[PDB]
Amino acid sequence: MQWTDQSFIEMMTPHHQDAIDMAEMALQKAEHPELKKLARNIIRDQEREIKEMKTWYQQWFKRPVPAMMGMHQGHGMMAMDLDALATAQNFDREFIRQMIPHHQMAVMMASNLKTNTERPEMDKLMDDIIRSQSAEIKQMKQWYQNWY
Ligand SMILES: [Cu+2]
Ligand SMILES: [Cu+2]
Numbered sequence: 732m733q734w735t736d737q738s739f740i741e742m743m744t745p746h747h748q749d750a751i752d753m754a755e756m757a758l759q760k761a762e763h764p765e766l767k768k769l770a771r772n773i774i775r776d777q778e779r780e781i782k783e784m785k786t787w788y789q790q791w792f793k794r795p796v797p798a799m800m801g802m803h804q805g806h807g808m809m810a811m812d813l814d815a816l817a818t819a820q821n822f823d824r825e826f827i828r829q830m831i832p833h834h835q836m837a838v839m840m841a842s843n844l845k846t847n848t849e850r851p852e853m854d855k856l857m858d859d860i861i862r863s864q865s866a867e868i869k870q871m872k873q874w875y876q877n878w879y
Pocket of ligand 2: 803806
């Protein structure tokens, strides 16, 4: 029903990781230059966000971020598939196919936590995640239509 600051960070940290791995693969495997630029931005932003959340987590809860089970498909965690990306005939298509719902997931988590948090740090972070990742979705949707 409702995320807390702690639970959000615990779930979002692993989720930001799979995205980064997808984006790192794009640096070499992407076909369109538009996509490599998006990938450099995703890496930059999401790694910066991971760091802020990890710092905040230690400050507020007096422990590092807890590492349950690993992140992968089959459990409704809405995780991604790096193997399928690497083997796809059309890299950019498969990247966009997987990244859009993954981005939408983050936007929805952010919007929800934004109604539950009292912390200005999280409010600010949620704002940026929503705004930045919604524009990235909009870019990817347009590119997908043009290319395919
Ligand atoms: Cu994820
Ligand atoms: Cu499993």
